[PDB]
């Protein structure tokens, strides 16, 4: 006598939100916000450099813990909490800009500046920089006066970048424990260091005094930098307190840089990274870390947003 029409239903429906309602039950739904983290840096198929105890900036100047990283090559660069840019207490002017540059460099390739010295000592060292005995920064040279208290000859040294891409140049200013100790190294009177590229001018006067003990030592070195363009020349006019660049660095290509405290893993592949690991997901959004880098779902404040994949559930 009859034929009825109907639709399916389930005992257990999944609740979702609409334009009109909150918690309307539908047949089936699927999550759109990713919460699952892999607690490892998923590095399968990528040239990876885990800096460990080496600080990214320390790859340019080369303290002992960066000896194995002086000319590295990478698609992915991992910075560790324990990493350190210096052996002899110091600081980089514009540290973070230079980091951002090195993070996406694809690594670095070094080339001798070809500086040659006459009238000064260039083998200065320290117990802070240990290579089985006192030493110094591998890529640098600590410039002095030949004998204690001796004068410093006003000096003009130049480097022309003859290559096709710009050269990262780095030099260091020394700050001795006393006003007395700056005179010992480089003679009395106030010394001047200046730098002149075709698109750059700046000046540097040392500032001796008594800092607190770091690595046992109370002196400091200021590191500085500029990118020197093709067929441009940088000139170093100085009279002391100067730490001299021996090699200039060049950037290899492209990479990505991250900061983490989890292990590396060549078994899983991912392109979205944060300090706690890797977000492997096809979901449009994520609620794991708003500072995740690489190619990631968009961060959102919501923990979950369920998307209906079925009709409304109408049981009973």
């Amino acid at each position: 006598d009859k034929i009825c029409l109907g639709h399916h239903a389930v005992s257990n429906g999944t609740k979702v939100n609409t334009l009109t309602e909150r918690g309307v039950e539908v047949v089936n739904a699927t999550e759109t916000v990713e919460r699952t983290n892999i607690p490892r840096i998923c590095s399968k198929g990528k040239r990876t450099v885990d800096l460990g105890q080496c600080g990214l900036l320390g790859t340019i100047t080369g303290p002992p813990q960066c000896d194995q990283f002086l000319e590295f090559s990478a698609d992915l660069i991992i910075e560790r909490r324990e990493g350190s840019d210096v052996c002899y207490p110091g600081k980089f002017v514009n540290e973070e800009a230079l980091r951002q540059i090195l993070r996406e460099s694809g690594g670095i390739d070094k080339e001798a500046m070809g500086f040659t010295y006459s009238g000064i000592r260039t083998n200065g060292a320290t117990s802070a920089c240990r290579r089985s005995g006192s030493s110094f920064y591998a890529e640098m040279k600590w410039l002095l006066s030949n004998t204690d208290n001796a004068a410093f000859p006003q000096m003009t040294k130049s480097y022309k970048n003859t290559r096709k891409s710009p050269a990262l140049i780095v030099w260091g200013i020394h700050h001795s424990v006393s006003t007395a100790e700056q005179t010992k190294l480089y003679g009395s009177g106030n010394k001047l260091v200046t730098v002149g590229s075709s698109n750059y001018q700046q000046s540097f006067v040392p500032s001796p005094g008594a800092r607190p003990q770091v690595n046992g030592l109370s002196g400091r070195i200021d590191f500085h930098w500029l990118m020197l363009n093709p067929n441009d020349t940088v000139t170093f006019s100085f009279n002391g307190a100067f730490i001299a660049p021996d090699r200039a660095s060049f950037l290899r290509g492209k990479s990505m840089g991250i900061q983490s405290g989890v292990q590396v893993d060549a078994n899983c592949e991912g392109d979205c990274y944060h300090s706690g690991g890797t977000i492997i997901s096809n979901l449009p959004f994520q609620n794991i870390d708003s500072r995740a880098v690489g190619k990631c779902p968009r961060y959102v404040k919501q923990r979950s947003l369920l998307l209906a994949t079925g009709m409304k559930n109408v049981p009973e």
Partner: protein, 170 residues
């Protein structure tokens, strides 16, 4: 729902229907049976999976670090970054909330639609042979063995074959 079928003039769904999304439960001299309409079911499924593909289609853009979790950046520039990032977070959180709500509404209405489409098709097959119940049911005046009901499901039911008898049975 917008089309008034699901949770509408159809009082509820069938938990026994595990074979598809939409279907028929007949009744006749030979007893009750049930089945699934593939065509209608597939048209909802294919539309729904079309949405999913759309939201899993995410070849994303690269972003790098602009701050530092180990060595805090200068404070002024840190607060500008954080303000920007929080502003972007707000936009996306809004976008995601709206997308899913907007999408979920459509899904529900879309499934409601397909049920109505199937309903009206059937009505259109039985021209004056059956009449409307209102619960989502067609009362047939002429009789229908399991062969008849399968003919309706196959789109082969011929109204002119059983016309005069059902007409008069009014």
């Amino acid at each position: 729902g917008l089309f008034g079928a699901i949770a509408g003039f159809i009082e509820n769904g069938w938990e026994g229907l595990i074979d598809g999304w939409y279907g028929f439960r007949h009744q006749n001299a030979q007893g009750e049976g049930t089945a699934a309409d593939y065509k209608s079911t597939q048209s909802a499924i294919d539309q729904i999976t079309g949405k999913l593909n759309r939201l899993i289609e995410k070849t994303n853009q690269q972003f790098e670090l602009i701050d530092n979790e180990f060595n805090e950046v200068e404070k002024q520039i840190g607060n500008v970054i954080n303000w920007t990032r929080d502003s972007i977070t707000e936009v996306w959180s809004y976008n995601a909330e709206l997308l899913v709500a907007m999408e979920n509404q459509h899904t529900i209405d879309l499934a409601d639609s397909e049920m109505d489409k199937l309903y009206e098709r059937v009505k259109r097959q039985l021209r004056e042979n059956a009449e409307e119940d209102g619960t989502g049911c067609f009362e047939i005046f002429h009789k229908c063995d399991d062969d008849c009901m399968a003919s309706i499901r196959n789109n082969t039911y011929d109204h002119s074959k059983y016309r005069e008898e059902a007409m008069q049975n009014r």
